[PDB]
Homo-oligomer: A and B are copies of this chain.
Amino acid sequence: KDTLIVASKVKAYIKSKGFMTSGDAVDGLNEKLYALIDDALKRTESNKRTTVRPTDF
């Protein structure tokens, strides 16, 4: 499964909050991103829609 996140920007934002990022952290976030998207598609379908809206996530 392809990375859906911009690693550099995630690391830069986390650094901005005063934290380092583990070697495998971004991979972990990517996995949570996929689950959010999959949950959203179940909500889209439940509302008899073909188009994912911000409200579905």
A residues with CB within 8 A of B? 1-6, 9-10, 12-14, 17-22, 24-25, 27-29, 31-34, 36-38, 40-44, 46-47, 50-57
Contacts and interface: CB of A to CB of B under 8 A. Distances in A.
A5 B5 contact: yes
A2 to B, nearest CB: 5
15 contacts: A4-B13, A5-B5, A19-B41, A20-B51, A21-B51, A21-B52, A22-B53, A25-B54, A25-B57, A28-B55, A29-B54, A32-B36, A32-B57, A33-B36, A46-B53
Contacts of A50: 18-20
A29 B48 CA distance: 20
